[PDB]
Amino acid sequence: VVRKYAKKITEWPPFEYMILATIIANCIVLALEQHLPDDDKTPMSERLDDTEPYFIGIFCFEAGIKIIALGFSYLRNGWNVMDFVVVLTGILATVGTEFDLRTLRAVRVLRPLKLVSGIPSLQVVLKSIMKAMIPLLQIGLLLFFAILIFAIIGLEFYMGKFHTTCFEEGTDDIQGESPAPCGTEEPARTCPNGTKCQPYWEGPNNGITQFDNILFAVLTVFQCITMEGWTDLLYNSNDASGNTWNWLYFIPLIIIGSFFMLNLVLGVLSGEFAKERERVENRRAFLKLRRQQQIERELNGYMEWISKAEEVILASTFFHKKERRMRFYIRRMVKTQAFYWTVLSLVALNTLCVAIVHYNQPEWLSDFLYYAEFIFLGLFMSEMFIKMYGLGTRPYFHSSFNCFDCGVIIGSIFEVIWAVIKPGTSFGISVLRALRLLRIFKVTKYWASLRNLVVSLLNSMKSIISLLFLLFLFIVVFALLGMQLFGGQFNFDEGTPPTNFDTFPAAIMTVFQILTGEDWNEVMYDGIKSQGGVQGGMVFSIYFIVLTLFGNYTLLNVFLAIAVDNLANAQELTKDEQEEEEAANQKLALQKAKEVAEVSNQKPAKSVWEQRTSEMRKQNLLASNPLRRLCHYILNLRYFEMCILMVIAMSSIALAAEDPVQPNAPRNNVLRYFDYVFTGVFTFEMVIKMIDLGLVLHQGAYFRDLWNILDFIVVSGALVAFAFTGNSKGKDINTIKSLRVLRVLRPLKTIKRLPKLKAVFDCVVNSLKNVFNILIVYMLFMFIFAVVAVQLFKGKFFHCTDESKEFEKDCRGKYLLYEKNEVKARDREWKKYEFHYDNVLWALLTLFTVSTGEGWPQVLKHSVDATFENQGPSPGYRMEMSIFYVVYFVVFPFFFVNIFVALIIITFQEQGDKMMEEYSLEKNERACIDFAISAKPLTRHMPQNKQSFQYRMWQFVVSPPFEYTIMAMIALNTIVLMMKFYGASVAYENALRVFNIVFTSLFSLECVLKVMAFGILNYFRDAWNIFDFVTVLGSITDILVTEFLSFLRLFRAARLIKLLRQGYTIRILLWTFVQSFKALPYVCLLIAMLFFIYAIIGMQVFGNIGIDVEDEDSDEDEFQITEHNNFRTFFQALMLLFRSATGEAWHNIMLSCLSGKPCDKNSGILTRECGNEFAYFYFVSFIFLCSFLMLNLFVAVIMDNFEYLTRDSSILGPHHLDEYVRVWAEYDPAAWGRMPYLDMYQMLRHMSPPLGLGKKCPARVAYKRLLRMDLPVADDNTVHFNSTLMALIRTALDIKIAKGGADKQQMDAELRKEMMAIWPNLSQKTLDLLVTPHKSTDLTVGKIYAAMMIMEYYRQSKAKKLQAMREEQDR
Ligand SMILES: CC(C)CCC[C@@H](C)[C@H]1CC[C@H]2[C@@H]3CC=C4C[C@@H](OC(=O)CCC(=O)O)CC[C@]4(C)[C@H]3CC[C@]12C
Ligand SMILES: CC(C)CCC[C@@H](C)[C@H]1CC[C@H]2[C@@H]3CC=C4C[C@@H](OC(=O)CCC(=O)O)CC[C@]4(C)[C@H]3CC[C@]12C
Ligand SMILES: CC(C)CCC[C@@H](C)[C@H]1CC[C@H]2[C@@H]3CC=C4C[C@@H](OC(=O)CCC(=O)O)CC[C@]4(C)[C@H]3CC[C@]12C
Ligand SMILES: CC(C)CCC[C@@H](C)[C@H]1CC[C@H]2[C@@H]3CC=C4C[C@@H](O)CC[C@]4(C)[C@H]3CC[C@]12C
Ligand SMILES: CC(C)CCC[C@@H](C)[C@H]1CC[C@H]2[C@@H]3CC=C4C[C@@H](O)CC[C@]4(C)[C@H]3CC[C@]12C
Ligand SMILES: CC(C)CCC[C@@H](C)[C@H]1CC[C@H]2[C@@H]3CC=C4C[C@@H](O)CC[C@]4(C)[C@H]3CC[C@]12C
Ligand SMILES: CC(C)CCC[C@@H](C)[C@H]1CC[C@H]2[C@@H]3CC=C4C[C@@H](O)CC[C@]4(C)[C@H]3CC[C@]12C
Ligand SMILES: CC(C)CCC[C@@H](C)[C@H]1CC[C@H]2[C@@H]3CC=C4C[C@@H](O)CC[C@]4(C)[C@H]3CC[C@]12C
Ligand SMILES: *[C@@H]1O[C@H](CO)[C@@H](O)[C@H](O)[C@H]1NC(C)=O
Ligand SMILES: [Ca+2]
Ligand SMILES: [Ca+2]
């Protein structure tokens, strides 16, 4: 909308830079604002606020220039639309205030996003991120359906249960400060003497967490899906209803909601990243990278060649000819391996020296280390100068390695002077010298893989920096939005939480915490509480839901894409140089023959990632002693090995029944006799295995096999335990109790014997070998962080229970603790924090806890409040220490962990399958042909027993009006289950129940109507029909009983699943992954054994700890071993290991299991001697092993369906072939198996390529494919179902399509042999059915169609042929 073209003036480069500058200034101004409660302003607020007219005027001016120049193509760009709305909303608020316009100020948060619009480079990177998450939307649709279904189920069971508590008998007052749900029955929690269970209490978490509405249930379910706070619901519902069945709701909720969805997200993303790599634009960048590396390798060889010759030439520089030679002499020494290894050994000493430091080191140690730092610093500075003079200033500095040595040397000087100026702060910068230890990988074969990874990372440094900036920008926008929504609103009566949005530094760290998903629910409760409460502030949960939902998967997308792309580049880059080096050597040796002519392990076959990646490259490019013989005999006997397997199974079950709490329980007395028998069986099999084999190392030694030692340990420990008990039963209880623990190795004896369980075990060990080299780098980097953390926070993690006292001497005596309406006297104690950094070993445990993500907000709070050594905390003292934990998250949890996930995906090997390159085809041609081997037309009845009645009523059942009626009722029926709510009137409850009777009637008619139409037998052969039938039968059952609990009507809640069949891509994705879990049963078994072994160890070691202990102190973090969480039974142990696997405060459980804890009343121990220091190893190893085994399960399921995940719609695939089946069912309604060919051409028109011709295909081109079919034509006009499906696949995939003539005679002979070679199981007659034996007598499918296409080309010419003479005749 302009005056056409009239002196329209365009932009010049400084203009957009001025715009960029003003945007950055506006961002700073927004970041400098502080919000105060209740209409209070800071003095700087007015000065910052009055700047808004200038910024809005500049933005309006630039928008005006652009709008007049383009002419209002301004709104064509999406970025300009975002710019326009920013300008529009600002002017409305800035100019005029009559309407309520405080809300419109919230739109200013989007202004930082104008950086993306201004900088075109950021737009390209932003396009990459959004492109990958387009497929992920279909996962979100599965996630929403899962949440909806579980919200309905939770609504039915848990509606309103949490509103009763232990009220005082006399008054309507809560008994204690912390209330819990109660019950009036024994299974539920019972109130003490002084109280009773009264009707109304607000509920847990101030009533925010509950199941009262469908909206409350959906929000509550979403919280459990994120695995944050889900155990508190499990314990609360156990108090209300008893613990018999509540685990059936929550355990499936976590597995399906959290672990299964995470599997699809990794699967879909990994497939997308594989397809992105083989894009034409991405391949060209890699090809440039490969060529540039080849130049560097060759150039390095030539540089050393001339360098050696230059020294050959060399043989007051003129007088001191030696002066040139000392430069040459020490140049030699630098190169020598003696120098290289000697300086490297010095680095090991320096790395050791900085690790010794601890909180109270002896004074002699401090003096030694104080001088040793100068000695090490002096040696490395001298080592700098020797290379500088020895190699020259220019050659030295140009080396990348030497520049890094310069930085640490310069940094080390900075620290020592900094210590003198400002004593009290040491950063331990010298530890960065330990990174030189990674050069040791050069001697190994692993250097090529590691160097190439760093090469690829440095190549894409520009992309990585842009990715982090965009990720940082979205944090700033959400931080600014949080300040607007929750400003000075967190000033609660109790106090202002540490996580508040008052200031910009506080808003970033609160937003960052929600992204990591730790205690995001706790922050949500504060945000809801600030705005009214549960009554009025429930709409503010959307800010937290969107932030954690988007942040969870945006972080995964950004960091996994970085890891996959760079690791895949390194693998290809490494493989190419190895084959290039091999090929060049063979060529050189061949050339060596001409010169002399005058006188003349096994590498695994690629991987699932590499094999698929190579195929996509081709397809894209193509388109462009008498006793011993006895002892050997028993071992051969299958009954013996089958018998011993049964004994192993029974031995494991015995370990699970034993009662830990009662050593003298009657059950343990009975089970003790069983222990004698099981050892006896294991003793007998041990000796005969020694007799059949040999103890001595004769290459068949019994002790040679590793599992044999494992068998030897179990039996030996049991025998020795008997000897100690034999002498005196209770002389030494400690060691015998330790030896009894070795029985937990009995389940591991199963792995060797079961063949497929051993195979799964070898795959897990194979994965460890691949990631071992990265694992060493991971620990070296984590070691550096631990040493730095020690220097920062050594001795500063001390506090006094009395806040005021900040020294140990002051913290003595008693103090007054002011609780609500009561004063209590408590002792003053100078105690250390639970997790601290007093040495490198304590630092690593603390950082490991932070890596798992649990409890790090508390560790961060302690880190910022630390003041000085041996002095107490002060709130907000050092707020710059937050940078330590932000940098730590970027490196290890975000970056290294996704390298571990990527590395396993790229290097995963095939599941057996023998060799698989002997057959030429392989690839995806198998799956399509395999389907063609086994297929059948979907039989549609067409009974004709009674055309008027029975067939007619059939056509109604299949009629679209009936089907859409079915979908409408199921949709309406679901909404009926969604309208239950707490406090509904008896009229409302009755009205809802009436609609149930209406629906269950109609849903019964559908079953009656289908059964008659389909028949008694055919109907009952479809899984959904039985599922539908059991659902109607269950619902109708309850109704009669009421007039003459209905949790089996929640089967009707599962009817919503039927709606999934309409959405195709979801149904295939859900079905394929489910099938993959069935094909991998032993992988699931390995995870079950890990839980079994760790459960039995927990019962024997940590079972004795008492739970009855409770006191007014109520240090809940101190005591996490309670009635709900303990090791007392096998099932109570498994729940503890599942809570820890999800990560719910596992670090506090580990501390609760340590030594010096009260024992149980009946444990038989009368002193406070319970728990072990084994709790450190018990939990730390479990978290590593549980995450590793679960990850291998994920990749196994992902890499099983990797063909589908990396599918392309253009190229034929097995998923397409199902479309052929439904079409064939209709054109052949009776499913005769024979269809006349006049229907066939119409069939090909209906289906899109590559399976069908498609609507817009040229007729003559369509005829070309028809000849390509080359199949015999039946004289009844029919085409076989199996034979026809074969050729359509062959035509599309170009599977050895012959040039014609004699070739067709050979390929049919050939292809039939491949399919015979692949499977000899297929029937020969059926094999000839799919591919007919060649018969030139039978006319091909082309021949009938060749009648039209060849003649129609002539037929149009025939009219022109008669024409050609005709105008010539007239002329
Ligand atoms: C690169 C790696 C292999 C270096 C070697 C490991 C060190 C980082 C660790 C291993 C064991 C640790 C030690 C384990 C226990 C102690 C005892 C601790 O002394 C006390 O508890 C009290 C001392 C006193 O009061 O005299 C001092 C630290 C020290 C030596 C630790 C220092 C750090 C050490 C040497
Ligand atoms: C999942 C696989 C590995 C099999 C499941 C093994 C355990 C979960 C089961 C198997 C036998 C069960 C036990 C069989 C019998 C009893 C007695 C039963 O009676 C009692 O209350 C104790 C007896 C008494 O009071 O004298 C309590 C549960 C318990 C220990 C059971 C606890 C759960 C056990 C150990
Ligand atoms: C994904 C990654 C790249 C984004 C991580 C965001 C960081 C850039 C943010 C998050 C926490 C922030 C810190 C939070 C707290 C402080 C203390 C504060 O410095 C003070 O001394 C303020 C005094 C006070 O607040 O009492 C402001 C800077 C700093 C280090 C902040 C610097 C910027 C940090 C590291
Ligand atoms: C060999 C495999 C099956 C081990 C199975 C042993 C289990 C099933 C048997 C063996 C010993 C049995 C216990 C022996 C002792 C008692 C105490 C008695 O007053 C009640 C039954 C009870 C609690 C039995 C329960 C079942 C029990 C634990
Ligand atoms: C085995 C050791 C290394 C730690 C155990 C792994 C688990 C407990 C840790 C390691 C990596 C961590 C995750 C790494 C990736 C992300 C980024 C974002 O998506 C949410 C946080 C989240 C989800 C972290 C939460 C917890 C996490 C999954
Ligand atoms: C990637 C490898 C080399 C890790 C080394 C980098 C780590 C150890 C460095 C990088 C940035 C550093 C922080 C930068 C600034 C400060 C503020 C200062 O008042 C206390 C130390 C503290 C908080 C530093 C601690 C150490 C730190 C986190
Ligand atoms: C598919 C869509 C259109 C339907 C879903 C919305 C229905 C099922 C939901 C959304 C809004 C909900 C209502 C919101 C608020 C209240 C008031 C409360 O005192 C009782 C429950 C009640 C009455 C809820 C019942 C369930 C409800 C009606
Ligand atoms: C594979 C495991 C067993 C090897 C690791 C051994 C270390 C980390 C663990 C395992 C067994 C542990 C010991 C087990 C029992 C006790 C008794 C306790 O009152 C003091 C600590 C002490 C002495 C533990 C110290 C730490 C310990 C030695
Ligand atoms: C507490 O209740 C139990 C329940 O029967 C009763 O036996 C006991 O005497 C009560 N205690 C007191 C102090 O009344
Ligand atoms: Ca958590
Ligand atoms: Ca977590």
d(CA 601, CA 604): 10
3-state secondary structure of 71: coil
Nearest to 1103 by CA among 1177, 1175, 1182: 1175
First to last CA, the chain: 61
Residue nearest to atom 22 of ligand 8 (CA): 1173
Residue nearest to atom 28 of ligand 1 (CA): 358
- Write the DSSP assignment of 741-753 as a string of letters: GGGGGTTTHHHHH
d(CA 888, CA 1366): 89
Residue nearest to atom 28 of ligand 2 (CA): 657
Single-letter amino acid code for the residue at 1132 = Q
Q: With beta carbons less than 8 A apart as the criterion, state whether 527 and 201 touch.
A: no
How many angstroms separate the alpha carbon of residue 1073 from the centre of ligand 11?
Answer: 25
3-state secondary structure of 818: strand
Q: What would the 3-class secondary structure string for 132-172 be? A: HCCCHHHHHHHHHHHHHHHHHHHHHHHCCHHHCEEEECCCC
CB within 8 A of 510, min separation 6: which ones? 479, 482, 499, 500, 501, 523
> Is 1174's C-beta closer than 6 angstroms to any atom of ligand 8?
yes
Task: Work out the number of other CB atoms within 10 angstroms of the CB of residue 311.
Answer: 12
Classify burial at 997, counting beta carbons within 10 Å of its beta carbon; exposed 0-12, middle 13-18, buried 19 or more: exposed
Q: With beta carbons less than 8 A apart as the criterion, state whether 674 and 649 touch.
A: no
d(CA 756, CA 577): 37
> Is 262's C-beta closer than 6 angstroms to any atom of ligand 6?
no
How many angstroms separate the alpha carbon of residue 226 from the centre of ligand 10?
Answer: 8
Task: Using the atom order of ligand 6, give the atom closest to the CA of residue 891.
Answer: 1
d(CA 849, CA 1148): 10
Phi/psi region, residue 1294 (left: phi>0; alpha: psi -120 to 50; beta: rest), is left
How many angstroms separate the alpha carbon of residue 783 from the centre of ligand 6?
Answer: 14
Pocket of ligand 2, candidates 667, 669, 1100: which has the most ligand atoms within 8 Å of its Cβ, to mutate?
Answer: 667
How many angstroms separate the alpha carbon of residue 1173 from the centre of ligand 8?
Answer: 6
Residue nearest to atom 21 of ligand 5 (CA): 516
Nearest to 136 by CA among 612, 560, 608, 614: 560
d(CA 1016, CA 1009): 11
Q: Are strands 798-800 and 814-819 parallel, antiparallel or unpaired?
A: unpaired
Residue found under tokens 């076959």: 605
DSSP state letter for 950: I
- Of all ligands present, the nearest one to the C-alpha of 353 is 1
Residue nearest to atom 11 of ligand 2 (CA): 657
Pocket of ligand 3, candidates 42, 473, 508, 512: which has the most ligand atoms within 8 Å of its Cβ, to mutate?
Answer: 508
Nearest to 227 by CA among 205, 207, 257: 257
The experimental technique used to determine this model is: cryo-EM
Crossing angle (nearest 10°) for helices 504-516 and 882-889: 30
CB within 8 A of 603, min separation 6: which ones? none
Residue nearest to atom 28 of ligand 6 (CA): 884
- Of all ligands present, the nearest one to the C-alpha of 741 is 8
d(CA 216, CA 160): 11
- Of all ligands present, the nearest one to the C-alpha of 465 is 3
Residue nearest to atom 35 of ligand 3 (CA): 883
Nearest to 564 by CA among 898, 1028, 175: 898
> Is 846's C-beta closer than 6 angstroms to any atom of ligand 1?
no
Nearest to 416 by CA among 406, 427, 407: 427
Crossing angle (nearest 10°) for helices 1214-1227 and 1281-1293: 140
- In degrees, rounded to 5, the angle at the alpha carbon of residue 661 between the alpha carbons of residues 660 and 667 is 65
**Residue count (the chain):** 1371
Pocket of ligand 5, candidates 520, 562, 852: which has the most ligand atoms within 8 Å of its Cβ, to mutate?
Answer: 852
> Which structure tokens are listed for 584?
């060049």
> Which structure tokens are listed for 1033?
């039968």
Q: Are strands 830-832 and 1278-1280 parallel, antiparallel or unpaired?
A: unpaired
Residue ranges of E strands in 276-383: none
Nearest to 358 by CA among 371, 369, 342: 369
d(CA 692, CA 712): 15
d(CA 2, CA 5): 8
d(CA 1044, CA 1023): 32
> Is 1110's C-beta closer than 6 angstroms to any atom of ligand 6?
no
Q: With beta carbons less than 8 A apart as the criterion, state whether 1144 and 230 touch.
A: yes
Strand partners, 197: 166
The two most distant CA atoms of the chain are separated, in Å, by: 132
Residue found under tokens 């690593």: 844
Nearest to 569 by CA among 892, 894, 278: 278
Ligand 7 site: residues with CB under 6 angstroms? 213-215, 975, 978-979, 981
DSSP state letter for 1159: B
Strand partners, 701: 694
Crossing angle (nearest 10°) for helices 856-865 and 840-851: 130
> Is 886's C-beta closer than 6 angstroms to any atom of ligand 3?
yes
How many angstroms separate the alpha carbon of residue 1165 from the centre of ligand 7?
Answer: 57
Task: Using the atom order of ligand 4, give the atom closest to the CA of residue 657.
Answer: 28
d(CA 71, CA 4): 8
Task: Using the atom order of ligand 5, give the atom closest to the CA of residue 1184.
Answer: 1
DSSP state letter for 196: E
3-state secondary structure of 198: strand
> Which structure tokens are listed for 1110?
């409770």
**Cα 688 to the center of its chain, rounded Å:** 48
Alpha-carbon torsion, ordered 909, 912, 917, 923, to 10 deg: -70
Q: With beta carbons less than 8 A apart as the criterion, state whether 126 and 45 touch.
A: no
**Residues in the chain preceding a C-to-N separation beyond 2.5 angstroms (breaks):** 72, 315, 600, 624, 1044
How many angstroms separate the alpha carbon of residue 400 from the centre of ligand 5?
Answer: 33
> Is 667's C-beta closer than 6 angstroms to any atom of ligand 4?
yes
**Cα 503 to the center of its chain, rounded Å:** 33
- In degrees, rounded to 5, the angle at the alpha carbon of residue 43 between the alpha carbons of residues 41 and 44 is 105
Resolution of the experimentally solved model in angstroms:
2.9
Q: With beta carbons less than 8 A apart as the criterion, state whether 895 and 563 touch.
A: yes
d(CA 1018, CA 1255): 35
Q: Are strands 814-819 and 822-827 parallel, antiparallel or unpaired?
A: antiparallel
> Which structure tokens are listed for 445?
């074969």
> Is 883's C-beta closer than 6 angstroms to any atom of ligand 6?
yes
d(CA 218, CA 153): 11
3-state secondary structure of 586: helix
How many angstroms separate the alpha carbon of residue 894 from the centre of ligand 6?
Answer: 18
Q: With beta carbons less than 8 A apart as the criterion, state whether 796 and 837 touch.
A: no
How many angstroms separate the alpha carbon of residue 1049 from the centre of ligand 7?
Answer: 21
Radius of gyration of the chain (CA): 38
Ligand 2 site: residues with CB under 6 angstroms? 653, 656-657, 666-667, 1130-1131
- Helix (H) or strand (E) holding 23, with range, is helix 13-31
Q: With beta carbons less than 8 A apart as the criterion, state whether 479 and 507 touch.
A: yes
> CA 198 → CA 134, 181, 984, distances in Å?
51, 11, 20
Q: Note if the bond before 1250 is cis, omega within 30 degrees.
A: yes
**Cα 1339 to the center of its chain, rounded Å:** 57
> Is 424's C-beta closer than 6 angstroms to any atom of ligand 6?
no
Residue found under tokens 């929504």: 485
518 is in an annotated binding site: yes
Nearest to 1086 by CA among 1201, 1181, 1185: 1185
Side-chain half-sphere CA neighbours of 305 within 13 A: 6
- Of all ligands present, the nearest one to the C-alpha of 975 is 7
> Is 1155's C-beta closer than 6 angstroms to any atom of ligand 8?
yes
Range 59-74 burial, b when 16+ CB lie within 10 A, else e: beebbebbbbebeeeb
> CA 644 → CA 275, 649, 1088, distances in Å?
50, 9, 21
> Is 356's C-beta closer than 6 angstroms to any atom of ligand 1?
yes
> CA 128 → CA 134, 541, 557, 733, distances in Å?
11, 30, 10, 65
How many angstroms separate the alpha carbon of residue 1124 from the centre of ligand 9?
Answer: 25
Residue found under tokens 């090997």: 909
- In degrees, rounded to 5, the angle at the alpha carbon of residue 514 between the alpha carbons of residues 512 and 520 is 150
How many angstroms separate the alpha carbon of residue 353 from the centre of ligand 1?
Answer: 11
d(CA 1012, CA 1031): 18
How many angstroms separate the alpha carbon of residue 654 from the centre of ligand 2?
Answer: 10
- Write the DSSP assignment of 1213-1264 as a string of letters: -HHHHHHHHHHHHHHSTT--SEEEHHHHHHHHHHSPTTTS--TT--HHHHHH
How many angstroms separate the alpha carbon of residue 895 from the centre of ligand 9?
Answer: 60
> Which structure tokens are listed for 209?
């967490």
- In degrees, rounded to 5, the angle at the alpha carbon of residue 842 between the alpha carbons of residues 839 and 847 is 120
Residue nearest to atom 9 of ligand 5 (CA): 852
Cβ < 5 A residues, ion ligand 10: 228, 1143
Nearest to 32 by CA among 483, 405, 650: 483
595 is in an annotated binding site: no
Nearest to 456 by CA among 558, 573, 610: 573
> CA 780 → CA 350, 430, 773, 774, 784, distances in Å?
14, 14, 11, 10, 6
